[PDB]
Design a protein around this ligand. Structure first.
Ligand SMILES: Nc1ncnc2c1ncn2[C@@H]1O[C@H](COP(=O)(O)OP(=O)(O)O)[C@@H](O)[C@H]1O
Ligand SMILES: Nc1ncnc2c1ncn2[C@@H]1O[C@H](COP(=O)(O)OP(=O)(O)O)[C@@H](O)[C@H]1O
Ligand SMILES: OC[C@H]1O[C@](O)(CO)[C@@H](O)[C@@H]1O
Ligand SMILES: OC[C@H]1O[C@](O)(CO)[C@@H](O)[C@@H]1O
Lengths: 296, 296
């Protein structure tokens, strides 16, 4: 009955599949175009739902056609959005994406602004006993640090079988987000963050960044087509190769698929080695199809 | 009380204003992004409305969030959409547009498909006495030829002050569309069509293509920043220079603005020379602002 909660961003992705990258100053038909619910935390809710886990999303929405599409899509997947922060006004962000079918490239034109992120005041109203796992996409670090501290104070009063497991994603190389390294039992660190901090390989990143994580936590670093690596308190450097499809056609959300699949596998009691393998398997399969529905 | 009717395409334009053309395989914020009702005939209704003429739109829509946005926008402008053909199913087309603020470039990723165009059976239900002018965007020529013939049969029974004036646009270089040359009192021919038919200047295009238009009609050929030219039955080659803004920032719909402004000026009894001038003035002003609302 307990759900998995993901806190972070939801956007509307308008995805244009093309057979060649558009030439500036021209008009040309795409191969296909679709509206797709996006955002890191939102995409991980999609994959968790497809994998069979009841999950909830916490993010910001503003009234309009965009939010109406997103709410209906959330409902279709069975993702709980009762804790979404509804802003009085604003523009729900929309990403225009160009997916080149010929070379597998992914180009994202991101919205110029975002709605205000979920506040710690917002998060304080959440009944934490509803959830066995809470994943936070690193965005507004000062507010999210307070959220993570609230979960720690909650867990201090709970016995072992009723503690809420926590994971965080640190994807953008913004110094403020690095306060999140010291929270959660699993920390997903992006390749962009690793390179920004001076590491040019997943193995180097784990060795160099492990001192930042909380006592007993596991650091996870996915490295695109090179697979994914992890380092936990037992001191073993773990690695899974990627599972590339015969033809890479859609990598948008592949990292979100990896994140959700690792969470799913760990929530079912699997080892980090198996969860890393499972995450690359599901994410690699996703890269060979459009959207997420085909991962099954 | 009589309105102007434009028959053709409506699409949803998602317009991304950027400071540099997006690099393939990257993510980057735009300067701004907006939803804008688009399509040639639909854009001309917008400009006609802003210029103060009551107008109506005839096109195809299908249920969904896209049509809901478009219908509300039509309503905001006061454009009558009672004769829109509502399809039972389908995807209302959406164009993803990249507008480079630095060089004024316009890149359009067009939807892969379109809804079925308005049929001659659809158009037969329209009360032609409602309209003093009917403009047809050349799309499904075999059906639109029947529409134009119906207007001719209607006008044959009307006295001089009650005849419906007709204009056509021939924008795409598709051979089937060239059946429309012989219909209407004003024929807008695009630069792309002129070059496809072997003419590299507006003046050459008018001289070489005038034999195709109906007896007494005027052929109009706009040539982007070179202005616009026209040739009517008096035999005088007319030309207006363009009226470029201090900085060209948004040319999407500039041709639709020119078309509507020429129609507007002619409907108010002005000469072709003045209507050509007026069309370049309004379209040139449009090129210096986003969307159409600022033309005033
Ligand atoms: N091009 C690719 N080919 C095969 N697998 C991939 C590819 N990109 C990503 N993956 C899979 O997805 C995971 C996450 O990659 P990441 O680099 O974080 O994705 P994103 O591009 O979404 O940020 C990898 O660990 C791998 O399992
Ligand atoms: N780059 C530009 N600078 C100035 N005026 C322009 C420009 N592009 C178009 N116009 C104006 O708009 C009119 C129509 O141009 P056209 O080439 O048909 O537009 P479109 O690019 O929308 O097809 C021109 O006759 C001119 O009045
Ligand atoms: O940065 C936000 C972008 O990233 C994604 O979440 C994919 O991971 C897209 O759905 C969204 O447009
Ligand atoms: O071809 C259709 C495209 O052209 C426009 O009508 C501009 O003239 C756009 O609004 C639409 O996306």
């Amino acid at each position: 009955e307990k759900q998995i909660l993901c806190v972070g961003l939801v956007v509307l992705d308008i995805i244009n599949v093309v057979d060649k990258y558009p030439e500036e100053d021209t008009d040309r038909r795409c191969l296909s175009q679709r509206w797709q619910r996006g955002g890191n935390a939102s995409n991980s809710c999609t994959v968790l739902s497809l994998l069979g886990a009841r999950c909830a999303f916490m993010g910001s929405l503003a009234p309009g056609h965009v939010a109406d599409f997103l709410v209906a899509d959330f409902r279709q997947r069975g993702v709980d959005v009762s804790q979404v922060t509804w802003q009085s006004q604003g523009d729900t962000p929309c990403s225009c994406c160009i997916v080149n079918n010929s070379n597998g490239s992914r180009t994202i034109i991101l919205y110029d602004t975002n709605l205000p992120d979920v506040s710690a005041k917002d998060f304080e109203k959440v009944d934490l006993t509803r959830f066995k796992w809470i994943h936070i996409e690193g965005r507004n670090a000062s507010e999210q640090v307070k959220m993570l501290q609230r979960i720690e104070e909650h867990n201090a009063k709970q016995p072992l079988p009723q503690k809420v497991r926590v994971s965080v994603e640190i994807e953008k190389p913004r110094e403020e987000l690095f306060q999140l390294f010291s929270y959660g039992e699993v920390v997903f660190v992006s390749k962009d963050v690793a390179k920004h901090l001076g590491f040019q390989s997943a193995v180097e990143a784990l060795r160099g960044l492990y001192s930042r994580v909380k006592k007993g936590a596991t650091l996870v670093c996915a490295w695109a087509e090179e697979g994914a690596d992890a380092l936990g308190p037992d001191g073993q450097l773990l690695h899974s190769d990627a599972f590339p499809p015969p033809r890479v056609v859609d990598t948008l959300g592949a990292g979100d698929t990896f994140n959700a699949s690792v969470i799913f596998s760990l929530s079912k009691g699997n080892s980090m080695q198996e969860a890393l393998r499972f995450g690359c398997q599901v994410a690699g399969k996703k890269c060979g199809l459009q959207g997420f529905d085909g991962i099954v």
